[PDB]
């Protein structure tokens, strides 16, 4: 093989909205995960079920690079067993998650003077999302007993709201680009990889 293209995900020019989170099924090699950990560019770098140093020391199959954009207060939601707007209705991590949560501030990138619609999120949902479920339905939500016929109005709301990304916003409301690395380790005797 050769090098592994983590630059395509982290250094992407544009990210997907959180409700329509992009998933990058990479499978070329293993890169030096110990290189990405000590990178000061990433402020949130939390791993689960495995230590960051031993990722290159371990062995897995498909490694999914989930990437999307949320706000600073919603960063702590990208974690197992959390709830809220994002964790329940946009991107859900399982209780037995095996991977890492990488996040960094993207106010210098995804914010525009006067707001930045673009990035959106699913407001509500009849039930909480399954783990790794992507809901991209743009159907008008029927909050009352009267049908909506796809019309916005009373008890008929558009299920997606746009983030209002301005540079003058507080850091808790600033855009944060998140990369969720999910990979399925092998099942060898505790000698080869264990």
């Amino acid at each position, epitope marked *: 093989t050769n090098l592994c293209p983590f630059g395509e995900v982290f250094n992407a020019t544009r990210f997907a909205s959180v409700y329509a989170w992009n998933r990058k099924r990479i499978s070329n090699c293993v890169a030096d995960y110990s290189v990405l950990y000590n990178s000061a560019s990433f402020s949130t770098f939390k791993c689960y079920g495995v230590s960051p140093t031993k990722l290159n020391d371990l062995c897995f199959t498909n490694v999914y690079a989930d990437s999307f954009v949320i706000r600073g207060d919603e960063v702590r939601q990208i974690a197992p067993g959390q709830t*809220g707007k994002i964790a329940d209705y946009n991107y859900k991590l399982p209780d037995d998650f095996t991977g890492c949560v990488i996040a960094w501030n993207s106010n210098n990138l995804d914010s525009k003077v006067g*707001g930045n619609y673009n990035y959106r999120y699913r*407001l*509500f949902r009849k039930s*909480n999302l399954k783990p790794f479920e992507r809901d991209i339905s743009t159907e008008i939500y029927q909050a009352g007993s009267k049908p909506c016929n796809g019309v*916005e*109005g009373f008890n008929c709301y558009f299920p997606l709201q746009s983030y*209002g990304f301005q540079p003058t916003n507080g850091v*808790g409301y600033q855009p944060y680009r998140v990369v969720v690395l999910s990979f399925e380790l092998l099942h060898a005797p505790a000698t080869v990889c264990g």
Partner: antibody, heavy 119, light 109 residues
Framework: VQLVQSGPEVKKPGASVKVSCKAS????????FHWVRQAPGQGLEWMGI????????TYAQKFQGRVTMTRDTSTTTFYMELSSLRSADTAVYYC?????????????WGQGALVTVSS | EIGMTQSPATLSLSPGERGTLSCRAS??????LAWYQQKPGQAPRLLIY???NRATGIPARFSGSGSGTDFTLTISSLEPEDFAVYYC??????????FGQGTKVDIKR
């Protein structure tokens, strides 16, 4: 960030009142707006919500058919119109911003507008 | 709709004491719960959102815990500025919101 409400008003029983809420500072995109009243001898009572964009309002059960919440499609002024006023409608009416939705926050409030209903 | 019950109706503790305010929901609201402080003659002020997250600029002595039906607002060390009525608010079903009856926090004398 600032929420400015209209002056206080006194109305006869059966009349209607429209309270304004002029807002400035932060982008009101991605920020819903609510209306909550506090009767003098009572606590907070939620009335309804209006989204930043086109209406898509939701009113509380006790106010269904009595309140109409609109916007000023310019001055980012959110209106609460309450019809068929009775003595129990005498209360201080607050407007409040909600980021995101669902959870969100009542981060910032207005000063409150006293509506006094009596003959 | 969802009914919210706060207990006790009034809590009277001295400055420096540990304060515990309860908020019970008629049905599970997951972590969809927010706490508020209203000083006399003032508009309410958010303290905790999503049951356990501290809002911006809120003093560290305020904290929240709980999920589903039982929620708790804790003031680790009461200060005189904390004399107020505290309301909890549900939002599990996005369109609608209800408040608790409020627990008035008095400075015990």
């Amino acid at each position: 960030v600032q929420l400015v409400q209209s002056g206080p008003e006194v109305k006869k029983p059966g009349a209607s009142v429209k309270v304004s809420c002029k807002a400035s500072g932060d982008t009101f995109i991605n920020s819903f707006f609510h209306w909550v009243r506090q009767a003098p001898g009572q606590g907070l009572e939620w009335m309804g919500i209006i989204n930043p964009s086109g209406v898509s309002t939701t009113y509380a059960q006790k106010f269904q058919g009595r309140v109409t919440m609109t916007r000023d499609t310019s001055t980012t002024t959110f209106y609460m119109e309450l019809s068929s006023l009775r003595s129990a409608d005498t209360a201080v009416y607050y407007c409040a911003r909600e980021n995101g939705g669902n959870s969100g926050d009542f981060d910032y409030w207005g000063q409150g507008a006293l509506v006094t209903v009596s003959s | 709709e969802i009914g919210m019950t706060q207990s006790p109706a009034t809590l009277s503790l001295s400055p420096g004491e540990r304060g515990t305010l309860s908020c019970r929901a008629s049905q599970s609201v997951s972590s969809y719960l927010a706490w508020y402080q209203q000083k006399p003659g003032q508009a309410p002020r958010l303290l905790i959102y999503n049951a356990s997250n501290r809002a911006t600029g809120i003093p560290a002595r305020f904290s929240g815990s709980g999920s589903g039906t039982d929620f708790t607002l804790t003031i680790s060390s009461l200060e005189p500025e904390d004399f107020a009525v505290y309301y909890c608010q549900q939002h599990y079903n996005w369109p609608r919101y209800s408040f608790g009856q409020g627990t008035k926090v008095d400075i015990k004398r």
